[PDB]
Design an enzyme around this catalytic site. Structure first.
Site, short mmCIF file in Angstrom:
data_model
loop_
_atom_site.label_atom_id
_atom_site.label_comp_id
_atom_site.label_asym_id
_atom_site.label_seq_id
_atom_site.Cartn_x
_atom_site.Cartn_y
_atom_site.Cartn_z
CB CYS A 29 19.65 -34.82 22.01
SG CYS A 29 18.44 -33.57 22.51
CB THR A 72 15.04 -31.71 21.75
OG1 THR A 72 16.38 -30.77 22.23
CG2 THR A 72 14.94 -32.88 22.61
N1 LIG Z 1 16.46 -36.44 23.54
C1 LIG Z 1 17.21 -37.40 23.21
N2 LIG Z 1 18.35 -37.50 24.09
C2 LIG Z 1 19.07 -38.65 23.78
C3 LIG Z 1 18.74 -39.55 22.87
N3 LIG Z 1 19.78 -40.41 22.98
C4 LIG Z 1 20.74 -40.05 23.85
N4 LIG Z 1 19.92 -38.90 24.42
C5 LIG Z 1 20.87 -37.88 25.46
O1 LIG Z 1 22.15 -37.72 25.26
C6 LIG Z 1 22.87 -38.02 26.47
C7 LIG Z 1 24.36 -38.11 25.93
O2 LIG Z 1 24.75 -36.86 25.41
P1 LIG Z 1 26.11 -36.64 24.81
O3 LIG Z 1 27.07 -36.67 25.90
O4 LIG Z 1 26.50 -37.89 23.81
O5 LIG Z 1 26.38 -35.40 24.33
C8 LIG Z 1 22.17 -39.18 27.22
O6 LIG Z 1 22.50 -38.96 28.41
C9 LIG Z 1 20.63 -38.66 26.96
O7 LIG Z 1 20.33 -37.60 27.83
C10 LIG Z 1 17.47 -39.53 22.19
O8 LIG Z 1 17.05 -40.40 21.32
N5 LIG Z 1 16.82 -38.54 22.36
K LIG Z 2 22.15 -31.90 19.95
#
Ligand SMILES: Nc1nc2c(ncn2[C@@H]2O[C@H](COP(=O)(O)O)[C@@H](O)[C@H]2O)c(=O)[nH]1
Ligand SMILES: [K+]
Ligand SMILES: Nc1nc2c(ncn2[C@@H]2O[C@H](COP(=O)(O)O)[C@@H](O)[C@H]2O)c(=O)[nH]1
Ligand SMILES: Nc1nc2c(ncn2[C@@H]2O[C@H](COP(=O)(O)O)[C@@H](O)[C@H]2O)c(=O)[nH]1
Ligand SMILES: Nc1nc2c(ncn2[C@@H]2O[C@H](COP(=O)(O)O)[C@@H](O)[C@H]2O)c(=O)[nH]1
Ligand SMILES: [K+]
Ligand SMILES: [K+]
Ligand SMILES: [K+]
Lengths: 329, 328, 329, 335
Positions: free
Chosen positions: D185, D187
């Site tokens: 992410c 953002t």
């Molecule tokens: N905002 C955003 N969130 C993503 C993207 N790809 C995955 N995510 C978020 O990251 C989460 C996984 O987070 P992690 O467990 O990898 O820290 C996903 O369930 C989804 O909410 C993206 O391109 N943009």
């Molecule tokens: K992040």
């Protein structure tokens, strides 16, 4: 020797909270802003993001691209009168979206005067000193105001609201806010003087708007999110140098591909041309070659449209009104 | 086992706020300061920045350059009587801008005594112990005061105001403040004892000035901004080692070009020459900076800028006009 | 799901304040402590710094050096009965400065029993479990107490005073305090359970001493300053693994010269011999070869003498009484 | 332009306090949880850890492993109808442990509808938008609810409890919580909008449970401790992408640069996804593309996650994962 009890925050210390709205998509968001300035009485409309008047980024080639996106360029003060005449001849459509830049010296004032008389379409002046808290700067603003009563005056830099008020009362329309945060600024290391960029903008924006004046958040943004935070904190405009550094439109040739990016009062600037133009003798850095600035613009505007969507702001106008920050670690 | 509720800050935790003034340019600013010391009753005039009495930086060659800028050098204690005699012969103009340094040992006191009698132009004594809070140090200060009633006495190091008062009442004119923050100091790592440099200077300055005494902020400055913060916090002088390390005028040859910089109680010092300082200090290789002139100009220039930005026409005015903000 | 409002500090978060005293030199300082234990009713005298009961550091060779400095060694639990017999034969002068180590398993208890009956000079037992907050551990302590009424019992680990009290009331004399901070502990990463070491020692020390009991600060010290802070916070003993790792006296050969150092419940220990001996399956690390441990001991003791000098403590006993911490950044 | 006085914490800022209990060993702990959802009225049983519906981790091959451990897989939305039919044919035992994923576009809804009709055994829907605070998403949830009254609806992402309430009242059963913390992410960097994951879960879990609803902690966990912390803070499920990234089961071939085995891991709305596939405003930010170290078979990672969460439960006195949040007390730390 007092310590202020209030912790002062920068951009990395906060995030914007998302809020309920009827805005689905970022394309719906209008980034254009309309300002009527306090002292000049002029009206501006555009996307209030300004390229800083640094040697590499504050160029006519950059302005030509920025103006296409309704964005603003503060042109560095080292272009000749002929260079400006040529720019006016070739890029009349941009002249509404540029500012001519001057230090507080007699020669700068003369040169600027000549440009403004030769190019009446340029209606923005950008004034910069080492010490924006000086009484000598207050009186220089009074002079420029009196010399150009219908020009819009950008003046900096400060970080506190009392000096915002004084400079606005003295004739500046827009106060450039930021001392320390700038990518190549070195005040903190060389003088220990400075202020966190968010808290600067927060306090100064209140002070400016109480007078129906305006501010530029000048420096500190390393990403579009910071640009969004600056706006959320109350910045009327956001001025960027580092983020625009390294592009094809920037002055300089390619040097791993790199472009040279140097402070306005840097040793490089000193050799090339600036002594107490800015508060510190700035850094000279090699920045990674980013390519064409188009793509960077689209990323900044796009991210700011997304921010607005996520806080419920249909117009950039509404951002601060809908900006709520959370403190993070 | 109590924890102090007050958080103690160092230089990196704060910035100085700029303030309205009539000062446009930094060249306007006078960095010279005039002090009349409490116990010695002597008067000093100069730029109150001191080269620390360390082996590599507190040298006669360094002092010759510092004195040209009206700046002060605390000379390391390992120079011979003859070396001082030669320096007096060759650089009489500097003698008003140097201090002779001594530990609390009998041998040190004798050697210093011989140097001061041989060089009456040296009017500053710098005394340094491992434990600046000991009664033994208080008594040694009393003795040095008695032995040299008209010499100005620097004594350290401490970080708290009660000891500042005690040492001043015992005869020291200037108290060297700082335990921990020194670039090659290792008290925190080796003893867990120490104090943040800003908070030290804040508290200790008040304490000294309440008695019409003076302090040196000793150690911790990594850049001219820190030097400026030290002064803003109330430091009468600022003492620097690391920032003066690595220059041509420093003791040692060039070794990437590097110079060796080592603690006063380091293993390197112990081999070359025990409880002179609170910790057995580090030995580091520092980047070769070149001639010290340039470094001096950066420090002075930045401090003039600071003063301009807070509205201080003279370095005296800094602390009066210093307002700090806490940052992250 | 409540968040504790009180921020909990570790050693890096504080410094000890120097205080006025009549102590010039560090050699004046007596590090020897004399303890009379609550439940065993035994008396101990020595420098209350303990080598942790890990495979590489809690060895007989290490104990033979530590004993010369009146220091303690908690011997790892994987030595055979014969190994102990031989160590009693050859190093009888050490037996007062070592503890035999056991898990809460039946086989561990039997093996320890056989060692203690064969070597009546060993008067300290070290008990360790994965979950020192378990009623099962409480009852194991009760059992060991009853089996060995005159042996002094170390038991761990915990980080909070209510469990300190329960374990002392259950028959442990000395409570091992620390969960998380250990150099090769991984509870924080693997379970998210843990407690900052300084705040552990502060709260636990109070709780132990209220009962006339004792605590070991177990883990977290990276330097002799930390050891000093542990004692300053109220730790009766301080137990060290990482700081003792890497020496010639340590189990293992030299591997840059390095020695292997691995957690008591590490994969390495599991393959070598542990499952829920400790709260987490610990790291295996290569540590730089430090040479002979004598030098390290001298640095630890020397620094702790200096600390005591600087706070005005002529005896290690006086340290906590004279310890004032300041919070730092 | 107000600043919230309350400091918002992430996982790194806290630790869980151990507490007195009768549990000696971690094997004693039951990680399975039983949920009865508010709007779907369905009942779920399993280990409430979810593989995120990302391209590389939310695969059928991953689901076939996850199911063995009674764990859940949110299947990424770019699988075809035929791909689902084949998965149902070959792995019928997994269908109770997977969710079909969709954006709020018309094409996504129609494809998902076809999959659900063709595979009646799939009873979980995962809905994902760029702006989970949008009235258009509220409406989309109402429509999915109405279209599939007996399916369990996952909807996100949000970080604040007023949106939790709205989305649950609008028909979502489980609200995906997290904006910012996700490994890929962006953002915060691109928009400056976001929220610390611990404070998110704390606030949003309260809000959801007041309605007898449920949440997923979505993103931010970099280790099993964080997973434990998520659950301790009130998370009903915990969704993981980066922690499952890099294994043999993951979509993609092994990369080999400089004596280093790696697998590519990319954002759902990344440039990589955009080129490969209708992801423009699927998630709040255009996500990163990273090379992650090759971790080997996911079995081992699963066992580390579950083992560490059993240990956590032991150490706080929770014999069931259900009891964790009730027995979770956090302490604020510095590092
Ligand atoms: N905002 C955003 N969130 C993503 C993207 N790809 C995955 N995510 C978020 O990251 C989460 C996984 O987070 P992690 O467990 O990898 O820290 C996903 O369930 C989804 O909410 C993206 O391109 N943009
Ligand atoms: K992040
Ligand atoms: N103090 C100082 N500021 C500079 C110098 N050069 C540029 N700046 C400041 O930094 C701003 C740009 O911030 P950036 O986007 O580079 O972080 C410029 O508009 C200008 O105000 C310099 O040499 N010294
Ligand atoms: N405690 C301790 N301090 C030292 C040692 N060597 C130098 N220092 C301190 O550090 C000061 C210089 O600090 P700096 O300017 O490098 O921060 C010296 O003036 C001295 O007070 C040492 O070996 N031990
Ligand atoms: N949880 C856990 N703790 C260990 C392991 N190995 C050693 N420890 C802990 O770390 C302590 C030593 O900490 P150190 O002095 O290395 O910081 C040991 O006495 C023990 O309590 C392990 O494998 N797992
Ligand atoms: K900067
Ligand atoms: K230091
Ligand atoms: K650890």
């Amino acid at each position: 020797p007092r310590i202020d009890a209030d912790l002062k925050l920068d951009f990395k210390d906060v995030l914007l909270r998302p809020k309920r709205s009827s805005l689905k998509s970022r394309a719906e968001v209008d980034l254009e802003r309309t300002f009527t300035f306090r002292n000049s009485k002029q009206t501006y409309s555009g996307i209030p993001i300004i390229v800083a008047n640094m040697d590499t980024v504050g160029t006519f080639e950059m302005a030509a691209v920025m103006s296409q996106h309704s964005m603003f360029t503060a042109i560095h003060k080292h272009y000749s009168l002929d260079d400006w005449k040529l720019f006016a001849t070739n890029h009349p459509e941009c002249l509404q979206n540029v500012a001519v830049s001057s230090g507080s010296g007699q020669n700068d004032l003369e040169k600027m005067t000549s440009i403004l008389e030769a190019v009446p379409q340029v209606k923005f002046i950008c004034l910069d000193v080492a010490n924006g808290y000086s009484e000598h700067f207050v009186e220089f603003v009074k002079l420029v105001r009196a010399k150009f009563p219908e020009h819009t005056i950008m003046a900096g830099n400060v970080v506190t609201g009392e000096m915002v008020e004084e400079l606005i009362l003295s004739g500046a329309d827009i106060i450039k806010v930021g001392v320390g945060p700038g990518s190549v600024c070195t005040t903190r290391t060389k003088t220990g003087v400075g202020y966190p960029q968010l808290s600067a903008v927060i306090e100064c924006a209140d002070s400016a708007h109480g007078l129906k004046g305006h501010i530029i958040s000048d420096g500190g943004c390393t990403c579009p999110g910071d640009v969004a935070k600056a706006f959320g904190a109350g910045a009327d405009f956001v001025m960027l140098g580092g983020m625009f550094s390294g592009h094809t439109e920037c002055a300089g040739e390619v040097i791993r591909k790199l472009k040279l990016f140097y402070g306005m009062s840097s040793d490089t600037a000193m050799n090339k041309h600036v002594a107490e133009y800015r508060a510190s003798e700035g850094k000279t850095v090699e920045v990674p070659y980013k390519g064409d600035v188009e793509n960077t613009i689209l990323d900044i505007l796009g991210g700011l449209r997304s921010t607005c969507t996520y806080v419920g702001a249909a117009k950039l106008k509404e951002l601060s009104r809908r900006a709520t920050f959370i403190r993070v670690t």
